[PDB]
Curated annotation (Swiss-Prot), chain B:
Its main location: nucleus. Keywords: Activator, Biological rhythms, Cytoplasm, Diabetes mellitus, Disease variant, DNA-binding, Glycoprotein, Isopeptide bond, Metal-binding, Nucleus, Obesity, Phosphoprotein, Receptor, Transcription, Transcription regulation, Ubl conjugation, Zinc, Zinc-finger. Residues 6-258 form the NR LBD domain. Changing residue 71 to H: In colon cancer; sporadic; somatic mutation; partial loss of ligand-binding. The 9aaTAD motif is a transactivation domain present in a large number of yeast and animal transcription factors. Belongs to the nuclear hormone receptor family. NR1 subfamily. This is Peroxisome proliferator-activated receptor gamma. PDPK1 activates its transcriptional activity independently of its kinase activity. The lineage of its organism: Eukaryota, Metazoa, Chordata, Craniata, Vertebrata. A motif (9aaTAD) lies at residues 250-258. The chain holds residues 233 to 504 of 505 of the full protein.
Length: 254, 259
Protein backbone atom coordinates (compact mmCIF):
# COMPACT_ATOMS: atom_id res chain seq x y z
CA UNK A 1 0.00 0.00 0.00
CA UNK A 2 2.98 2.30 0.56
CA UNK A 3 3.66 2.09 -3.18
CA UNK A 4 0.26 3.74 -3.64
CA UNK A 5 1.27 6.59 -1.31
CA UNK A 6 4.44 6.96 -3.38
CA UNK A 7 2.40 6.99 -6.59
CA UNK A 8 0.18 9.73 -5.17
CA UNK A 9 3.26 11.68 -4.10
CA UNK A 10 4.78 11.45 -7.58
CA UNK A 11 1.48 12.44 -9.21
CA UNK A 12 1.15 15.49 -6.97
CA UNK A 13 4.78 16.45 -7.63
CA UNK A 14 4.36 16.25 -11.42
CA UNK A 15 1.16 18.30 -11.19
CA UNK A 16 2.94 20.80 -8.91
CA UNK A 17 5.71 21.22 -11.50
CA UNK A 18 3.08 21.63 -14.23
CA UNK A 19 1.11 24.24 -12.27
CA UNK A 20 3.73 26.45 -10.59
CA UNK A 21 6.40 27.97 -12.89
CA UNK A 22 8.59 29.46 -10.14
CA UNK A 23 9.40 26.39 -8.06
CA UNK A 24 11.26 26.53 -4.76
CA UNK A 25 14.36 24.98 -6.34
CA UNK A 26 14.40 27.71 -9.00
CA UNK A 27 13.84 30.50 -6.48
CA UNK A 28 16.54 29.02 -4.24
CA UNK A 29 18.96 28.85 -7.18
CA UNK A 30 18.22 32.52 -7.92
CA UNK A 31 18.74 33.54 -4.28
CA UNK A 32 22.17 31.86 -4.12
CA UNK A 33 23.78 31.85 -7.56
CA UNK A 34 23.35 30.53 -11.10
CA UNK A 35 20.88 37.62 -11.40
CA UNK A 36 17.72 39.44 -10.30
CA UNK A 37 17.38 43.21 -10.13
CA UNK A 38 17.42 44.28 -6.48
CA UNK A 39 14.96 46.91 -5.23
CA UNK A 40 16.35 48.41 -2.02
CA UNK A 41 15.16 52.05 -2.02
CA UNK A 42 12.99 54.47 -3.99
CA UNK A 43 15.53 55.05 -6.77
CA UNK A 44 16.05 51.33 -7.40
CA UNK A 45 12.26 51.05 -7.45
CA UNK A 46 12.14 53.74 -10.16
CA UNK A 47 14.81 51.99 -12.24
CA UNK A 48 12.98 48.73 -11.57
CA UNK A 49 9.74 50.02 -13.08
CA UNK A 50 11.73 51.51 -15.97
CA UNK A 51 13.69 48.27 -16.56
CA UNK A 52 11.50 45.33 -15.47
CA UNK A 53 8.27 44.69 -17.40
CA UNK A 54 5.52 44.99 -14.78
CA UNK A 55 1.90 44.28 -15.68
CA UNK A 56 0.12 46.13 -12.84
CA UNK A 57 1.20 49.68 -13.75
CA UNK A 58 -1.87 51.60 -14.93
CA UNK A 59 1.70 57.05 -4.04
CA UNK A 60 4.36 54.34 -4.27
CA UNK A 61 3.20 52.13 -1.38
CA UNK A 62 -0.27 51.74 -2.91
CA UNK A 63 1.39 50.74 -6.19
CA UNK A 64 3.57 48.08 -4.54
CA UNK A 65 0.51 46.71 -2.73
CA UNK A 66 -1.51 46.63 -5.97
CA UNK A 67 1.24 44.65 -7.69
CA UNK A 68 1.27 42.22 -4.77
CA UNK A 69 -2.46 41.80 -5.44
CA UNK A 70 -1.97 41.17 -9.18
CA UNK A 71 0.45 38.39 -8.26
CA UNK A 72 -2.09 37.08 -5.75
CA UNK A 73 -4.76 36.76 -8.45
CA UNK A 74 -2.36 34.89 -10.74
CA UNK A 75 -1.48 32.67 -7.78
CA UNK A 76 -5.16 31.91 -7.13
CA UNK A 77 -5.47 30.68 -10.71
CA UNK A 78 -2.35 28.49 -10.44
CA UNK A 79 -3.63 27.03 -7.16
CA UNK A 80 -6.98 26.31 -8.80
CA UNK A 81 -5.35 24.40 -11.65
CA UNK A 82 -3.21 22.44 -9.18
CA UNK A 83 -6.20 21.63 -6.96
CA UNK A 84 -8.05 20.17 -9.94
CA UNK A 85 -5.22 17.61 -10.25
CA UNK A 86 -5.67 16.33 -6.67
CA UNK A 87 -7.37 12.91 -6.96
CA UNK A 88 -11.02 13.15 -5.94
CA UNK A 89 -11.19 16.96 -5.84
CA UNK A 90 -13.17 17.39 -9.06
CA UNK A 91 -15.56 14.60 -8.04
CA UNK A 92 -16.52 16.64 -4.96
CA UNK A 93 -19.58 18.86 -4.82
CA UNK A 94 -19.03 21.99 -6.91
CA UNK A 95 -19.98 24.34 -4.07
CA UNK A 96 -17.53 22.45 -1.86
CA UNK A 97 -14.75 22.90 -4.43
CA UNK A 98 -15.45 26.64 -4.56
CA UNK A 99 -15.47 26.84 -0.76
CA UNK A 100 -12.22 24.87 -0.33
CA UNK A 101 -10.42 27.08 -2.85
CA UNK A 102 -11.95 30.27 -1.43
CA UNK A 103 -10.69 29.51 2.08
CA UNK A 104 -7.42 27.82 1.09
CA UNK A 105 -5.85 30.15 -1.46
CA UNK A 106 -4.50 32.50 1.22
CA UNK A 107 -2.78 29.84 3.34
CA UNK A 108 -1.28 28.34 0.19
CA UNK A 109 -0.24 31.78 -1.08
CA UNK A 110 1.77 32.44 2.07
CA UNK A 111 3.14 28.88 2.18
CA UNK A 112 4.53 29.28 -1.34
CA UNK A 113 5.50 32.89 -0.67
CA UNK A 114 7.92 31.51 1.92
CA UNK A 115 9.58 29.67 -0.99
CA UNK A 116 10.49 33.03 -2.58
CA UNK A 117 11.61 34.72 0.67
CA UNK A 118 14.74 34.78 2.78
CA UNK A 119 15.51 36.85 5.87
CA UNK A 120 16.46 39.82 3.64
CA UNK A 121 13.80 40.06 0.92
CA UNK A 122 11.42 38.42 -1.52
CA UNK A 123 11.65 37.59 -5.22
CA UNK A 124 9.22 39.39 -7.53
CA UNK A 125 8.13 39.24 -11.18
CA UNK A 126 8.67 35.50 -11.72
CA UNK A 127 12.15 35.83 -10.22
CA UNK A 128 13.26 38.80 -12.34
CA UNK A 129 13.50 41.04 -9.26
CA UNK A 130 14.21 40.94 -5.54
CA UNK A 131 12.54 43.50 -3.28
CA UNK A 132 14.37 43.89 0.02
CA UNK A 133 12.68 43.36 3.38
CA UNK A 134 14.05 46.71 4.58
CA UNK A 135 12.48 48.61 1.68
CA UNK A 136 9.16 46.94 2.51
CA UNK A 137 9.50 48.00 6.15
CA UNK A 138 10.32 51.57 5.07
CA UNK A 139 6.90 51.96 3.43
CA UNK A 140 4.51 54.27 5.25
CA UNK A 141 1.82 52.97 7.58
CA UNK A 142 -0.15 50.83 7.35
CA UNK A 143 1.67 49.44 4.31
CA UNK A 144 4.87 48.90 6.31
CA UNK A 145 3.32 46.18 8.51
CA UNK A 146 2.03 44.05 5.61
CA UNK A 147 5.04 41.86 4.79
CA UNK A 148 6.93 41.62 8.09
CA UNK A 149 4.56 38.92 9.46
CA UNK A 150 5.09 37.00 6.22
CA UNK A 151 8.87 37.29 6.63
CA UNK A 152 8.71 36.13 10.25
CA UNK A 153 6.66 33.13 9.14
CA UNK A 154 8.95 32.41 6.19
CA UNK A 155 12.07 32.24 8.37
CA UNK A 156 10.67 29.59 10.71
CA UNK A 157 8.94 27.73 7.87
CA UNK A 158 12.06 27.73 5.69
CA UNK A 159 14.01 26.39 8.68
CA UNK A 160 12.20 23.10 8.00
CA UNK A 161 14.10 22.84 4.67
CA UNK A 162 11.21 21.37 2.70
CA UNK A 163 11.52 20.83 -1.04
CA UNK A 164 8.94 21.02 -3.83
CA UNK A 165 7.89 17.37 -3.55
CA UNK A 166 7.11 17.93 0.15
CA UNK A 167 5.30 21.22 -0.49
CA UNK A 168 3.10 19.62 -3.17
CA UNK A 169 1.56 17.17 -0.71
CA UNK A 170 1.47 19.81 2.04
CA UNK A 171 -0.49 22.18 -0.21
CA UNK A 172 -2.81 19.36 -1.28
CA UNK A 173 -3.44 18.74 2.43
CA UNK A 174 -4.21 22.43 3.00
CA UNK A 175 -6.80 22.45 0.20
CA UNK A 176 -8.72 19.43 1.53
CA UNK A 177 -9.48 21.03 4.91
CA UNK A 178 -12.80 19.59 6.05
CA UNK A 179 -13.48 22.45 8.48
CA UNK A 180 -14.01 25.25 5.95
CA UNK A 181 -17.27 27.06 6.82
CA UNK A 182 -20.22 26.17 4.62
CA UNK A 183 -19.16 22.75 3.34
CA UNK A 184 -22.01 20.44 2.31
CA UNK A 185 -20.28 17.03 2.31
CA UNK A 186 -17.29 16.82 4.65
CA UNK A 187 -16.83 13.02 4.53
CA UNK A 188 -15.08 12.70 1.12
CA UNK A 189 -13.01 15.82 1.83
CA UNK A 190 -11.68 14.36 5.08
CA UNK A 191 -11.16 10.98 3.39
CA UNK A 192 -9.03 12.55 0.65
CA UNK A 193 -7.18 14.57 3.30
CA UNK A 194 -6.47 11.44 5.34
CA UNK A 195 -4.98 9.76 2.27
CA UNK A 196 -2.97 12.92 1.53
CA UNK A 197 -1.78 13.03 5.14
CA UNK A 198 -0.59 9.43 4.95
CA UNK A 199 1.24 10.27 1.72
CA UNK A 200 2.80 13.33 3.37
CA UNK A 201 3.97 11.29 6.36
CA UNK A 202 5.59 8.64 4.17
CA UNK A 203 7.11 11.34 1.94
CA UNK A 204 8.65 13.21 4.87
CA UNK A 205 10.00 10.01 6.41
CA UNK A 206 11.59 8.88 3.14
CA UNK A 207 12.90 12.33 2.14
CA UNK A 208 14.06 13.57 5.57
CA UNK A 209 15.08 10.49 7.57
CA UNK A 210 17.20 12.54 10.00
CA UNK A 211 14.23 14.68 11.10
CA UNK A 212 12.30 12.56 13.61
CA UNK A 213 9.04 14.51 13.96
CA UNK A 214 9.19 16.81 10.92
CA UNK A 215 5.64 15.74 10.05
CA UNK A 216 4.35 16.98 13.42
CA UNK A 217 6.16 20.32 13.12
CA UNK A 218 4.86 20.82 9.58
CA UNK A 219 1.34 20.22 10.89
CA UNK A 220 2.08 22.72 13.67
CA UNK A 221 2.92 25.33 11.01
CA UNK A 222 -0.70 25.33 9.80
CA UNK A 223 -1.83 27.11 12.97
CA UNK A 224 0.75 29.82 12.28
CA UNK A 225 -0.61 30.00 8.72
CA UNK A 226 -4.16 30.54 9.95
CA UNK A 227 -2.86 33.23 12.30
CA UNK A 228 -1.10 35.02 9.42
CA UNK A 229 -4.27 34.90 7.31
CA UNK A 230 -6.64 35.83 10.16
CA UNK A 231 -4.47 38.80 11.15
CA UNK A 232 -3.91 39.66 7.47
CA UNK A 233 -7.57 40.20 6.59
CA UNK A 234 -7.68 42.73 9.44
CA UNK A 235 -4.97 44.76 7.72
CA UNK A 236 -7.02 44.22 4.56
CA UNK A 237 -10.15 45.89 5.95
CA UNK A 238 -8.05 48.67 7.49
CA UNK A 239 -6.55 48.83 3.99
CA UNK A 240 -10.14 49.23 2.80
CA UNK A 241 -10.29 52.20 5.20
CA UNK A 242 -7.18 53.85 3.70
CA UNK A 243 -7.74 53.66 -0.09
CA UNK A 244 -10.72 55.64 -1.40
CA UNK A 245 -14.28 50.83 -10.62
CA UNK A 246 -13.91 47.91 -13.02
CA UNK A 247 -10.46 47.28 -11.54
CA UNK A 248 -11.96 46.86 -8.06
CA UNK A 249 -14.16 43.99 -9.28
CA UNK A 250 -11.07 42.06 -10.42
CA UNK A 251 -9.52 42.53 -6.97
CA UNK A 252 -12.43 41.77 -4.62
CA UNK A 253 -10.14 39.64 -2.42
CA UNK A 254 -6.36 39.06 -2.27
CA UNK B 1 -7.69 11.98 -30.39
CA UNK B 2 -4.34 13.80 -30.59
CA UNK B 3 -4.33 17.44 -29.48
CA UNK B 4 -8.13 17.38 -29.52
CA UNK B 5 -7.91 16.06 -25.95
CA UNK B 6 -6.27 19.32 -24.83
CA UNK B 7 -9.16 21.25 -26.37
CA UNK B 8 -11.63 18.91 -24.66
CA UNK B 9 -9.91 19.51 -21.32
CA UNK B 10 -10.11 23.26 -21.97
CA UNK B 11 -13.82 22.93 -22.78
CA UNK B 12 -14.48 20.95 -19.59
CA UNK B 13 -12.52 23.50 -17.55
CA UNK B 14 -14.45 26.43 -19.02
CA UNK B 15 -17.77 24.65 -18.46
CA UNK B 16 -16.90 23.90 -14.83
CA UNK B 17 -15.90 27.53 -14.23
CA UNK B 18 -19.09 28.61 -16.01
CA UNK B 19 -21.29 26.56 -13.67
CA UNK B 20 -19.30 27.92 -10.73
CA UNK B 21 -19.69 31.55 -11.88
CA UNK B 22 -23.32 31.84 -13.09
CA UNK B 23 -26.02 30.59 -10.68
CA UNK B 24 -28.82 30.69 -13.31
CA UNK B 25 -27.65 28.50 -16.18
CA UNK B 26 -29.56 28.06 -19.43
CA UNK B 27 -30.58 24.55 -18.36
CA UNK B 28 -32.35 25.82 -15.24
CA UNK B 29 -33.89 28.68 -17.22
CA UNK B 30 -35.36 26.21 -19.70
CA UNK B 31 -36.58 23.93 -16.91
CA UNK B 32 -38.40 26.97 -15.49
CA UNK B 33 -39.78 28.40 -18.74
CA UNK B 34 -41.18 25.10 -20.05
CA UNK B 35 -43.11 23.00 -17.52
CA UNK B 36 -40.66 20.43 -15.99
CA UNK B 37 -41.75 21.49 -12.48
CA UNK B 38 -44.38 22.54 -10.02
CA UNK B 39 -41.66 24.05 -7.78
CA UNK B 40 -39.79 26.13 -10.40
CA UNK B 41 -42.83 28.00 -11.72
CA UNK B 42 -42.31 31.78 -11.93
CA UNK B 43 -44.68 34.58 -11.05
CA UNK B 44 -45.67 36.32 -14.29
CA UNK B 45 -45.60 40.12 -14.45
CA UNK B 46 -47.65 41.57 -17.32
CA UNK B 47 -49.42 44.73 -16.07
CA UNK B 48 -49.53 47.18 -13.16
CA UNK B 49 -51.47 44.93 -10.79
CA UNK B 50 -49.27 41.90 -11.48
CA UNK B 51 -46.19 44.06 -10.90
CA UNK B 52 -47.51 45.45 -7.60
CA UNK B 53 -48.52 41.89 -6.71
CA UNK B 54 -45.12 40.49 -7.69
CA UNK B 55 -43.14 43.06 -5.71
CA UNK B 56 -43.67 40.98 -2.57
CA UNK B 57 -41.64 37.91 -3.61
CA UNK B 58 -38.92 39.93 -5.37
CA UNK B 59 -42.06 55.67 -10.99
CA UNK B 60 -42.69 52.27 -12.55
CA UNK B 61 -40.51 52.43 -15.67
CA UNK B 62 -37.76 53.97 -13.54
CA UNK B 63 -38.08 51.12 -11.04
CA UNK B 64 -37.85 48.46 -13.76
CA UNK B 65 -34.87 50.29 -15.28
CA UNK B 66 -33.04 50.43 -11.94
CA UNK B 67 -33.72 46.71 -11.51
CA UNK B 68 -32.11 46.08 -14.89
CA UNK B 69 -29.15 48.19 -13.74
CA UNK B 70 -28.65 46.24 -10.50
CA UNK B 71 -28.92 42.94 -12.38
CA UNK B 72 -26.32 44.32 -14.81
CA UNK B 73 -23.89 45.12 -11.98
CA UNK B 74 -24.34 41.63 -10.53
CA UNK B 75 -23.77 40.20 -14.02
CA UNK B 76 -20.55 42.20 -14.40
CA UNK B 77 -19.36 40.69 -11.12
CA UNK B 78 -20.15 37.15 -12.31
CA UNK B 79 -18.53 37.73 -15.72
CA UNK B 80 -15.44 39.09 -13.98
CA UNK B 81 -15.22 35.97 -11.82
CA UNK B 82 -15.57 33.80 -14.93
CA UNK B 83 -13.00 35.84 -16.87
CA UNK B 84 -10.35 35.36 -14.19
CA UNK B 85 -10.72 31.60 -14.78
CA UNK B 86 -9.89 31.81 -18.51
CA UNK B 87 -6.34 30.38 -18.81
CA UNK B 88 -3.97 33.25 -19.49
CA UNK B 89 -6.42 36.09 -18.81
CA UNK B 90 -4.99 37.08 -15.42
CA UNK B 91 -1.48 36.83 -16.90
CA UNK B 92 -2.20 39.66 -19.35
CA UNK B 93 -1.46 43.34 -18.88
CA UNK B 94 -3.83 44.78 -16.29
CA UNK B 95 -4.94 47.59 -18.62
CA UNK B 96 -5.79 44.98 -21.25
CA UNK B 97 -7.79 43.00 -18.68
CA UNK B 98 -9.82 46.10 -17.80
CA UNK B 99 -10.34 46.84 -21.50
CA UNK B 100 -11.47 43.30 -22.36
CA UNK B 101 -14.00 43.30 -19.53
CA UNK B 102 -15.09 46.85 -20.42
CA UNK B 103 -16.01 45.93 -24.00
CA UNK B 104 -17.09 42.31 -23.51
CA UNK B 105 -19.33 42.65 -20.47
CA UNK B 106 -22.48 43.75 -22.32
CA UNK B 107 -22.08 41.40 -25.28
CA UNK B 108 -21.94 38.57 -22.74
CA UNK B 109 -24.83 40.08 -20.77
CA UNK B 110 -27.14 40.03 -23.78
CA UNK B 111 -25.85 36.61 -24.90
CA UNK B 112 -26.76 35.07 -21.55
CA UNK B 113 -29.95 37.14 -21.39
CA UNK B 114 -31.04 35.20 -24.47
CA UNK B 115 -30.95 32.08 -22.25
CA UNK B 116 -33.59 33.64 -19.98
CA UNK B 117 -35.90 34.64 -22.84
CA UNK B 118 -38.57 33.31 -25.12
CA UNK B 119 -40.67 35.28 -27.60
CA UNK B 120 -43.10 36.27 -24.81
CA UNK B 121 -40.88 37.50 -21.98
CA UNK B 122 -37.80 37.11 -19.80
CA UNK B 123 -37.05 35.52 -16.44
CA UNK B 124 -36.15 37.89 -13.59
CA UNK B 125 -35.01 37.73 -9.96
CA UNK B 126 -33.08 34.45 -10.26
CA UNK B 127 -36.03 32.93 -12.13
CA UNK B 128 -38.61 33.68 -9.43
CA UNK B 129 -40.29 36.10 -11.84
CA UNK B 130 -41.07 36.39 -15.54
CA UNK B 131 -41.76 39.80 -17.08
CA UNK B 132 -43.61 39.73 -20.38
CA UNK B 133 -42.29 41.28 -23.59
CA UNK B 134 -45.43 43.34 -24.22
CA UNK B 135 -45.46 44.78 -20.70
CA UNK B 136 -41.86 45.90 -21.22
CA UNK B 137 -42.87 47.35 -24.59
CA UNK B 138 -45.73 49.28 -22.93
CA UNK B 139 -43.38 51.41 -20.81
CA UNK B 140 -43.17 55.13 -21.49
CA UNK B 141 -40.74 56.45 -24.10
CA UNK B 142 -38.07 55.66 -24.59
CA UNK B 143 -38.03 52.93 -21.93
CA UNK B 144 -40.52 50.91 -23.98
CA UNK B 145 -37.96 50.47 -26.77
CA UNK B 146 -35.14 49.30 -24.49
CA UNK B 147 -35.77 45.55 -24.62
CA UNK B 148 -37.18 44.85 -28.10
CA UNK B 149 -33.79 44.44 -29.87
CA UNK B 150 -32.74 42.06 -27.09
CA UNK B 151 -35.90 40.02 -27.69
CA UNK B 152 -35.37 39.89 -31.46
CA UNK B 153 -31.73 38.87 -31.05
CA UNK B 154 -32.76 36.29 -28.46
CA UNK B 155 -35.33 34.81 -30.85
CA UNK B 156 -32.77 34.53 -33.65
CA UNK B 157 -30.01 33.29 -31.31
CA UNK B 158 -32.00 30.69 -29.37
CA UNK B 159 -32.64 28.99 -32.73
CA UNK B 160 -29.00 27.85 -32.68
CA UNK B 161 -29.99 25.68 -29.67
CA UNK B 162 -26.75 26.04 -27.73
CA UNK B 163 -26.42 24.55 -24.27
CA UNK B 164 -24.31 25.91 -21.41
CA UNK B 165 -21.18 23.99 -22.41
CA UNK B 166 -21.19 25.79 -25.77
CA UNK B 167 -21.92 29.20 -24.24
CA UNK B 168 -19.01 28.93 -21.79
CA UNK B 169 -16.49 28.71 -24.64
CA UNK B 170 -18.40 31.26 -26.73
CA UNK B 171 -18.35 33.94 -24.04
CA UNK B 172 -14.72 33.06 -23.36
CA UNK B 173 -14.12 33.86 -27.04
CA UNK B 174 -16.02 37.12 -26.57
CA UNK B 175 -13.81 38.20 -23.65
CA UNK B 176 -10.53 37.57 -25.49
CA UNK B 177 -11.17 39.93 -28.41
CA UNK B 178 -8.01 41.49 -29.82
CA UNK B 179 -9.88 44.19 -31.76
CA UNK B 180 -10.94 46.11 -28.63
CA UNK B 181 -9.97 49.80 -28.70
CA UNK B 182 -6.96 50.73 -26.59
CA UNK B 183 -5.37 47.31 -26.08
CA UNK B 184 -1.63 47.38 -25.43
CA UNK B 185 -0.57 43.79 -26.24
CA UNK B 186 -2.85 42.30 -28.90
CA UNK B 187 -0.70 39.23 -29.72
CA UNK B 188 -1.18 37.32 -26.41
CA UNK B 189 -4.93 38.02 -26.43
CA UNK B 190 -5.10 36.68 -29.99
CA UNK B 191 -3.12 33.56 -29.02
CA UNK B 192 -5.52 32.81 -26.15
CA UNK B 193 -8.51 33.46 -28.40
CA UNK B 194 -7.03 31.17 -31.05
CA UNK B 195 -6.97 28.39 -28.46
CA UNK B 196 -10.53 29.25 -27.38
CA UNK B 197 -11.73 29.25 -31.00
CA UNK B 198 -10.23 25.81 -31.58
CA UNK B 199 -11.98 24.59 -28.43
CA UNK B 200 -15.28 26.13 -29.57
CA UNK B 201 -15.03 24.62 -33.06
CA UNK B 202 -14.39 21.14 -31.65
CA UNK B 203 -17.10 21.54 -29.00
CA UNK B 204 -19.70 22.57 -31.57
CA UNK B 205 -18.70 19.71 -33.87
CA UNK B 206 -19.01 17.09 -31.12
CA UNK B 207 -22.04 18.55 -29.33
CA UNK B 208 -24.03 19.42 -32.49
CA UNK B 209 -22.84 16.94 -35.15
CA UNK B 210 -25.97 17.68 -37.22
CA UNK B 211 -25.78 21.50 -37.03
CA UNK B 212 -24.05 22.29 -40.31
CA UNK B 213 -21.62 25.23 -40.00
CA UNK B 214 -22.91 26.13 -36.54
CA UNK B 215 -19.47 27.57 -35.75
CA UNK B 216 -19.76 30.13 -38.56
CA UNK B 217 -23.33 31.13 -37.67
CA UNK B 218 -22.43 31.54 -33.99
CA UNK B 219 -19.44 33.70 -34.96
CA UNK B 220 -21.77 35.75 -37.17
CA UNK B 221 -24.08 36.49 -34.21
CA UNK B 222 -21.39 38.81 -32.77
CA UNK B 223 -22.47 41.37 -35.39
CA UNK B 224 -25.95 41.46 -33.87
CA UNK B 225 -24.39 41.70 -30.40
CA UNK B 226 -22.35 44.74 -31.51
CA UNK B 227 -25.36 46.50 -33.05
CA UNK B 228 -27.40 45.87 -29.88
CA UNK B 229 -24.71 47.40 -27.66
CA UNK B 230 -24.46 50.47 -29.91
CA UNK B 231 -28.21 51.10 -30.03
CA UNK B 232 -28.30 50.71 -26.25
CA UNK B 233 -25.59 53.31 -25.62
CA UNK B 234 -27.47 55.71 -27.90
CA UNK B 235 -30.70 55.17 -25.96
CA UNK B 236 -28.72 55.86 -22.77
CA UNK B 237 -27.44 59.08 -24.34
CA UNK B 238 -31.08 60.12 -24.71
CA UNK B 239 -32.00 59.11 -21.15
CA UNK B 240 -29.12 61.19 -19.75
CA UNK B 241 -30.82 64.28 -21.20
CA UNK B 242 -34.48 63.47 -20.56
CA UNK B 243 -33.95 62.35 -16.94
CA UNK B 244 -31.72 64.83 -15.10
CA UNK B 245 -32.85 63.37 -11.74
CA UNK B 246 -31.73 59.79 -12.46
CA UNK B 247 -28.32 58.21 -11.96
CA UNK B 248 -26.52 55.45 -13.83
CA UNK B 249 -24.61 52.99 -11.68
CA UNK B 250 -20.93 53.98 -11.25
CA UNK B 251 -19.69 50.61 -12.53
CA UNK B 252 -22.03 50.94 -15.52
CA UNK B 253 -20.81 54.52 -15.97
CA UNK B 254 -17.18 53.38 -16.15
CA UNK B 255 -18.16 50.58 -18.53
CA UNK B 256 -20.07 52.80 -20.98
CA UNK B 257 -17.45 55.59 -20.93
CA UNK B 258 -15.98 56.07 -24.44
CA UNK B 259 -17.47 52.80 -25.69
C1 LIG C 1 -37.73 45.46 -11.40
O1 LIG C 1 -38.10 44.45 -12.29
C2 LIG C 1 -37.02 43.86 -12.96
C3 LIG C 1 -35.94 43.36 -12.24
C4 LIG C 1 -34.86 42.77 -12.90
C5 LIG C 1 -34.87 42.69 -14.33
N1 LIG C 1 -33.99 42.18 -15.23
C6 LIG C 1 -34.49 42.36 -16.44
C7 LIG C 1 -33.81 41.94 -17.75
O2 LIG C 1 -32.44 41.81 -17.48
C8 LIG C 1 -31.59 42.75 -18.08
C9 LIG C 1 -32.04 43.59 -19.09
C10 LIG C 1 -31.18 44.51 -19.67
C11 LIG C 1 -29.86 44.60 -19.24
C12 LIG C 1 -28.90 45.61 -19.88
C13 LIG C 1 -28.90 46.96 -19.17
S1 LIG C 1 -30.24 47.89 -18.74
C14 LIG C 1 -29.44 49.14 -18.06
O3 LIG C 1 -29.96 50.09 -17.58
N2 LIG C 1 -28.14 48.93 -18.12
C15 LIG C 1 -27.73 47.72 -18.73
O4 LIG C 1 -26.60 47.38 -18.86
C16 LIG C 1 -29.41 43.76 -18.23
C17 LIG C 1 -30.27 42.84 -17.65
N3 LIG C 1 -35.66 42.97 -16.35
C18 LIG C 1 -36.52 43.33 -17.47
C19 LIG C 1 -35.94 43.18 -15.03
C20 LIG C 1 -37.03 43.78 -14.35
Amino acid sequence: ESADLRALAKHLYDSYIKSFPLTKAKARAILTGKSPFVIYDMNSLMMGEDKIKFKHITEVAIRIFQGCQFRSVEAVQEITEYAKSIPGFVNLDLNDQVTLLKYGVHEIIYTMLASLMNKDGVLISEGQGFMTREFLKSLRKPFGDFMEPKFEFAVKFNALELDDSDLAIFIAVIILSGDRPGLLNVKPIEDIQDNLLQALELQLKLNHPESSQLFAKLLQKMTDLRQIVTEHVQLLQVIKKTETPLLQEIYKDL
